[PDB]
Structure formats: C-alpha cells, structure tokens
Amino acid sequence: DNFIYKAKALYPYDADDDDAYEISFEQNEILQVSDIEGRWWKARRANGETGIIPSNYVQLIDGPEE
C-alpha cells in the first residue's frame, strides 16, 4: 500500500549507465524507500534523485510511514 521506509546504505553502489533506472548512493547515506516486497527497491535520495536500488546493499532503519 502507501508505506515509505527509511534505509541506511551498508556500502556504496554505483549504478550502471546501461541500466538507467538504477541510482547510485554512498555508504551510510540515508534513503527513503518503498515497494520493499521484492529484491530491488524504489529509492529517493536527499538530492531528489529517484530510481531503484539493490536491497542487499541497505538496512531498514525506520518506517512504515504514510
């Protein structure tokens, strides 16, 4: 449903240019995430960047929130 969560990156990730729906992030960066039922999650960075992320690279730290 509508829930958003907060995740902390355990490691950096560099998205490929070839798969242009992924986003990169830094180790210890806090991300807002949703659609966490599967392996690739929807993320938003503080800078407004939006895309999908590998869920094994992050840890859930807060949520759910409406």
């Binding site: 490691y11 990730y13 798969d19 590998p54 094994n56 690279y57």
Partner: peptide, 9 residues
C-alpha cells in the same frame, strides 16, 4: 534481475 554481489567485507 539478480542482485549484485555484496562488496568486500
């Protein structure tokens, strides 16, 4: 799509 391997620990 498979998940990437975790980096070096």
């Amino acid at each position: 799509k498979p998940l990437p391997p975790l980096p070096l620990a």
